[PDB]
Design a protein around this nucleic acid. Structure first.
Lengths: 129, 129, 129, 129, 129, 129
RNA sequence: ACAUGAGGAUUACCCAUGU
RNA sequence: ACAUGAGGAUUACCCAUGU
RNA sequence: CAUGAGGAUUACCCAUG
RNA sequence: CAUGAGGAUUACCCAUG
């Protein structure tokens, strides 16, 4: 098939959608970025390795930029005022079936589903209590 | 909000759902676990501190049991053969507003949304190709 | 050509066939695996580099699971008791033409063709006698 | 029975066939070569050893020569312009049944069957993509 | 999705066309090679790195071989009488948007377009007069 | 007769076209510059020298400016926010006939032709994936 | 001597790292 | 080089403890 | 690492900070 | 002078023989 396809990272109902696409697979790290200047793009990187003698380890990273225009030396340039970084590590024992793995995925989706504790607190600049 | 409540981690339409509930709150770290022996349960923990002068950081963790051939309630060794571990670290600059944070959440949701590349690879014991 | 596609590794006439599909392409190394837990799957990887000034070299690897008494999806230890490993290294002088290479392939096919000495010994837990 | 028999290494439909035969078993290494001068012959060598305290290891080697006539010192001699070398190592756990081993063999045949990705790329001076 | 596909390097109508196909992609260096004798193949390599804080830098390379037969000692081999070497480096600020790049490319295509000074002088064994 | 004429560097239909014209030719280095503010002009340079006994070597260079206004102290000047830099070197044996060269050029044009891997990756702020 | 290498070769040899 | 950290970051990098 | 109308056996070598 | 998937203020600088 090829899973290296572009996808929608931030869905705002067809319009305003942040869509990210394959930009590089050099060095075994898969990369997707938005269509901006390199300095303002959104970035998503992913890679897997057979870490332990019996584990596999996914290393995923996402960069969310706060686009802004900065005046440097009398000239204006496109840039990010700051970035938000998400980095995650997932270790799955080699004994895990596809059925087993799908479970992991569904669980991760449930973790961030609108309404649940965590994404709630996050988007409210709050902790859990 | 007042978010430390029970929720659905794995949703199978109601029948077969995996629900995780508040199990501990020592040190400010919120913990949720499913109704199993701790050796086989689903666990979720989360906390927020200010990593540095400019950023705050969420540290979210999830543990997912291997189920295929699992023996409910039994002693399954080695432990690293029956468990998967997720470790997330979300860094957010003190300048992010509640809206900013909401987008960051959506970005995460999209990353793992069903059908998109990342979960696809994971759920198929695959990398990017 | 445009060859990184799924194919049949073990053919049992259609019924019982073992199919292996593209599972990863990091670093240029193509990987194919069967639909199993990685601990029990069939794996195939392949790559080509120029070993030296005069030759190129293919490095092909295959992993075949032990099935007799196998427990589908379960945790089978020790790993070296349940897996077989094939490692091939094909060195070809830069002077070999496409025809030259075709013969080299046929030579390989014949080496393992059903009925010939080598596979006969292997498939019978035997040496040459 | 005795598996140490001659076989056809390169099949071109009865005519033009490269046929190889038993030439030496000295030192525990089985050898087959074509009917040429020693300098232009095709060679196939095979051997097995009880490597690990629980593995068996087949070590197979094949030499495909590019026959040519070289004029050395005003005199012509039969020789190989260059050779193509195939070397493979197969490790099978002692617990493997004959049924298990046959599987390994069938898998190796499938790997090189005309049409499949690998032999395809090889005979086209190409990599997999 | 991959941009590591094979393509036409030299276009001579429909036939007489030089085609180059993926060979290897180790160390973040993509490589393409035309078919048949590697000794006479065409070669193309490409890569990108963050040269500095502000710029990214591409390094492209192309080899054009002069096909010939080399007879020595009465032994002939397919070789390259010689090779023409192209090597280029393109540096682009991180402020370059997806548009800024398309423009940079047009400039490159225009530089070599038929009739224009440079490609003309080259193909005429000439300099600028 | 002169090949030191002005030409179209960037082709945007009939209007929006970037034109470059002879500026200077000192030291055997031909130079072209687009019109208006030199500070925002496009630049192309070219030259050839006998690199060795067997080869001649071309050195081509192109500058693509990002036009912008720089206000400083309330004084604005037409400037280049930044520039994209292209520099290439082509080496060709003295045995290359007028044909051998035309081929080398086609290879160059093909390398950058629309749709092909390299020009694509560049214009997409991407590498090879 | 094993083990490991998308390590090399004049191809039943050699190299490097590990024990 | 792994392992571990509710360790840090300019974010495919660094730090500390462990072997 | 960065520049060279610096050479090549073409992802290497050299001068120079 | 020659190599570098070596940087740039882009016919310059640097490492390396």
């Amino acid at each position: 098939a090829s899973n290296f396809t572009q996808f929608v990272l931030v869905d705002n109902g067809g319009t305003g959608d942040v869509t990210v696409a394959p930009s590089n697979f050099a060095n075994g790290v898969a990369e997707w970025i938005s269509s901006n200047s390199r300095s303002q793009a959104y970035k998503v990187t992913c890679s897997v390795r057979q870490s332990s003698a019996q584990n596999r380890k996914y290393t995923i990273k996402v960069e969310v930029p706060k686009v802004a225009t900065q005046t440097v030396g009398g000239v204006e340039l496109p840039v990010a005022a700051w970035r938000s970084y998400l980095a995650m590590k997932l270790t799955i024992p080699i004994f895990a079936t596809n059925s087993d793995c799908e479970l992991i995925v569904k669980a991760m989706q449930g973790l961030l589903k609108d309404g649940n504790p965590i994404p709630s607190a996050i988007a409210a600049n709050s902790g859990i209590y």
